[PDB]
Amino acid sequence: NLCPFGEVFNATTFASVYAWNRKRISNCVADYSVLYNSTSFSTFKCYNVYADSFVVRGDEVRQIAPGQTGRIADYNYKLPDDFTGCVIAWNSNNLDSKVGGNYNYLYRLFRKSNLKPFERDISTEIYQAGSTPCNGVEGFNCYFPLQSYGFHPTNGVGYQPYRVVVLSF
């Protein structure tokens, strides 16, 4: 009895990368040649299945790999170096972007430290960039930790919304 990957791959609305969804599926056969030929993906790297997924813009899809570095890998979704699973991603400009821009998709932009593998942070505390404290109030060197992806239909593929699914074991 094969796995119901359509449950997460074809979900109505995905989650922001910083608040990534962790849907887990157990005791089903996870075949790969079947998931490949289902739809032409843009990324299909491989290295009780946890199928966690989220939306990131295209030029940051490369950060969903073992031992990467950058906004996404550091502060949003960190994979360990010994990752044993698959990273599946594909374009979704028509679904996740609207004329004038879809802003529902967010990402963490600063953090006092890096994420451990598979850690998820969804705090809303004012990031202190300077020696002066913020005291909850936002200003110079006092930035809100979450920002919004643009996602206009005119953006280049680098700044275009991409659906990402990671099969972990």
């Epitope: 202190q128 300077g130 020696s131 002066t132 404290p133 110079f140 060197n141």
Partner: single-chain antibody, 229 residues
């Protein structure tokens, strides 16, 4: 390794406009906030304004509203202060300084200063003793009183004859890297004291305190130390 190298001196006519530079190296430019300090002859330090090189955000002390513009060039790892419409009041030494947070609070590295001379409810820090004299080996204390609560967010700086300020104490009572055990910091809230334990020959300098609790940052008036032997 870390090094803030500034432009040369510039003499200009009044009502002119000049852009000085602060070329950084030895560290990742986008990591730390850059600041600028004005200091007139024999007068104290005035926090001029800051800039975040990672995104361009700035903050100006309203005392010097619209008299300068802070910018950064990430390709050349250089910070710029463009002074505009120069009057005789503007002639002074201008220091660029680096915010050492998240490691060493306040301004842990200072440029060498560019001497610009033209020719043709805030926080207040109180340093009662302008001058003060001791001898080698004596103990001595310097005091600061703030108009408001500033918690422990205060730094202590040392300016030796004709030299850029060097950080001594950050966060009320923590020494910077390579500061003798003789300098000990003390205080909390409203009253802060800096104690120089075994006064040395080197210690002949002018000591300022500086609050980094709220912008615009403010300095003390300078307490001059003088040694005889």
């Amino acid at each position: 390794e870390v090094q803030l190298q500034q432009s040369g001196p510039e003499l200009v006519k009044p009502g002119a406009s000049v852009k000085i530079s602060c070329k950084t190296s030895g560290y990742t430019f986008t990591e730390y906030t850059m600041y600028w300090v004005k200091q007139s002859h024999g007068k104290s330090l005035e926090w001029f304004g800051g800039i975040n090189p990672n995104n361009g955000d700035t903050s100006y002390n309203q005392k010097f509203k619209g008299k300068a513009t802070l910018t950064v060039d990430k390709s050349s790892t250089t910070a710029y202060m463009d002074l505009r419409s120069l009057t005789s009041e503007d002639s002074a030494v201008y220091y660029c300084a680096r915010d050492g947070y998240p490691y060493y609070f306040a301004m842990d590295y200072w440029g060498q200063g560019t001497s610009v001379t033209v020719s043709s409810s805030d926080i207040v820090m109180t340093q009662s003793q302008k001058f003060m004299s001791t001898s080698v080996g004596d103990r001595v204390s310097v005091t600061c009183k703030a108009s408001q609560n500033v918690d422990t967010n205060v730094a202590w700086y040392q300016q030796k004859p004709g030299q850029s300020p060097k950080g001594l104490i950050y966060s009320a009572s923590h020494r910077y890297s390579g500061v003798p055990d003789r300098f000990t910091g003390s205080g909390s809230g409203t009253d802060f004291t800096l104690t120089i334990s075994n006064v040395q020959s080197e210690d002949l300098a002018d000591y300022f305190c500086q609050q980094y609790n709220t912008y615009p940052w403010t300095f003390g008036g300078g307490t001059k130390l003088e040694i005889k032997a």
